[PDB]
Each structure stands twice: as structure tokens, then as C-alpha cells.
Write a protein that binds this DNA or RNA. Structure first.
Lengths: 48, 49, 48, 40, 49
DNA sequence: GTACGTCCGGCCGTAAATTCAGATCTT
RNA sequence: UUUUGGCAUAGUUGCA
DNA sequence: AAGATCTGAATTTACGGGCGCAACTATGCCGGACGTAC
């Protein structure tokens, strides 16, 4: 998202980046909630 | 060829099928061993019903 | 005897039906011991 | 009669619940109906 | 590998969907005494469900 | 030319939400 | 000349 | 008087918890891409 703003990229990709960053920080503090699916570590195991 | 199937010991396809107790001793296999289990990486695995 | 009144003492030995009904009786003892242990501490920890 | 006791009842007493398993009223009488079976 | 892993770990179902897989079906055979081996081979497991 | 092979990219208690009867306003 | 260590799982078993 | 509103009071999903410790085991996260040798 930083290089998107530095380049001045399009808005829809920026919104998608904000969405994914929201999901990543939310599952980084709390990888269990009734929202998006859980985060896995690319090894078929949820993150702690 | 499509893969390899583990073979339950003393089944109809295990090499110990229908062997007398002498031949089991020659292969260092206990004749009183009931079988009924697989060998996976050397570990004896049994499937609980 | 039909509904599980065993009449022989342990000295005399139970009959097959009597033995099976006695095993049924002791199974509840084992299960209630298990659930007591399952509830061990929980009430006590909440209280303290 | 049959009334809940043991660790379930103790649980409900400490785990205060709006739903008792065996709620009851040990209700007493004072007049002649206390001794008269017909009136009670 | 697919059978092997499922028999090596006892997780049954799809490997990548092991989160919701039934576990403990396959167990290492208990070789402590012959009676224990026979008891383990003749064993039924009732899941909670 | 061909393959290999190894280095890089992908239960119960709250608690919120939905529907029904006074009440002031509106008419 | 002074070290040492895989985390998270799943199963089995002992005592209460 | 009638109404519409409309604002406080009865019914449905939905997290979120679920015994002290011990002991032992056994198992675990790739495919394109680029070069080099033969």
C-alpha cells in the first residue's frame, strides 16, 4: 500500500490492500472471531 | 503403476500368509504374533474400529 | 432376576445375567467418579 | 419426593440460575387445614 | 504418501482439511504384553459426535 | 538434445435485532 | 578455556 | 373521531466458556525456472 501511494496507484486496489491489512492486523491480535476465516501459516495450522 | 498400498500383516497378501510356524521362525517372526496391523516407517500401527 | 436383582452373594458367585447386571451397576459408579473428577476444582476455583 | 441435590444443586446455588431443575414451595398451613386432610 | 500419512498420524479425511478430520483412528500398537496387544487389536472406539 | 536437480516465487446467559399496543401529536 | 535448546498438536496411560 | 406515527415491550441467532497434574509415545510445512554438466 505504501508503494501504491508513492506511485499514486488506483483506488480499488488501494481499498483491497486496506481490506487485507485490516484482516491481517485483526488476525494478528486475535486469530479467532465470527468474521472472515482464520489465518493459517501456509502449513495447514492456524496461527497463535 | 499408481501407488503403494500398505499391507496388513498376516493378511492374504502379506508374505507371512499361510506359512508354517517353522518358516515364521526362519524369518524371525513370532508364530504367536496375531498380525492384524500395518508397519508404517517401522512403527506398528493398528486401526481402531 | 429379570430386572436385575442379584440373589447370590459374592461367595456364591453370580450367574451370567446377574454378573452382567452387576457390571451395569458398577459402570455408573465408574462414570460418576469420572464426572466428579471432571467437576473437581471448577466449583472450588470459582469460589476461591 | 425427587429433588435435585449434590454438585448440580450446589452449582445452581453458586451459579445463580433463572431455571431451577426442581423448583418447589414447601408451603405450610395454619388453620384446621394443617391437621385436617380433607381441608388440606 | 496419502494412506501412509493417514496411518502414520491417525488423522482421517483430507490432509489439508485436517482441522476438521477425525483423529486417533490409527494408533501405535501397544507392545507391553501379549494380552495388551490382543486387547488393542480387538478395540472399538465410539466418538463423541 | 535431454534429463536431472537443486535454487527462487506463492447447555445458558446476555445481547442485539424484529414486531405490537399507549400516546402525544396530527388531522 | 564450563554448556543445554525445536514450538504447537494428536493419541495412550497413572493417581486422584 | 380517525389515523399515522411511533416508541416501549414480547420472541429468534450467536459467542463462549468445558478437572488437578503427572508419565510416555509418535508425527509434522512445494513447483516453476534457471543453469550446468554430460
Amino acid at each position: 500500500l505504501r508503494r501504491n501511494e508513492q506511485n499514486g496507484a488506483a483506488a480499488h486496489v488501494i481499498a483491497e490492500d486496506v481490506k487485507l491489512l485490516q484482516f491481517h492486523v485483526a488476525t494478528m491480535v486475535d486469530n479467532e472471531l465470527p468474521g472472515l476465516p482464520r489465518a493459517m501459516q501456509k502449513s495447514g495450522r492456524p496461527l497463535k | 503403476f499408481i501407488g503403494k498400498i500398505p499391507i496388513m500383516l498376516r493378511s492374504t497378501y502379506c508374505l507371512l500368509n499361510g506359512l508354517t510356524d517353522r518358516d515364521l521362525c526362519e524369518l524371525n517372526e513370532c508364530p504367536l504374533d496375531p498380525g492384524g496391523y500395518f508397519i508404517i516407517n517401522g512403527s506398528e500401527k493398528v486401526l481402531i474400529a | 432376576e429379570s430386572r436385575g436383582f442379584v440373589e447370590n452373594s459374592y461367595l456364591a458367585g453370580l450367574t451370567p445375567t446377574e454378573f452382567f447386571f452387576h457390571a451395569m451397576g458398577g459402570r455408573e459408579g465408574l462414570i460418576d467418579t469420572a464426572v466428579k473428577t471432571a467437576e473437581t476444582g471448577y466449583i472450588q476455583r470459582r469460589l476461591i | 419426593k425427587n429433588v435435585t441435590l449434590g454438585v448440580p444443586r450446589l452449582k445452581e446455588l453458586i451459579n445463580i440460575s433463572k431455571k431451577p431443575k426442581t423448583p418447589s414451595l414447601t408451603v405450610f398451613l395454619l388453620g384446621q387445614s394443617a391437621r385436617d386432610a380433607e381441608r388440606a | 504418501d496419502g494412506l501412509k500419512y493417514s496411518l502414520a498420524t491417525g488423522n482421517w479425511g483430507d490432509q489439508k482439511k485436517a482441522h476438521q478430520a477425525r483423529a486417533g483412528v490409527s494408533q501405535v500398537l501397544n507392545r507391553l504384553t501379549f494380552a495388551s496387544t490382543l486387547s488393542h487389536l480387538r478395540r472399538l472406539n465410539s466418538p463423541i459426535g
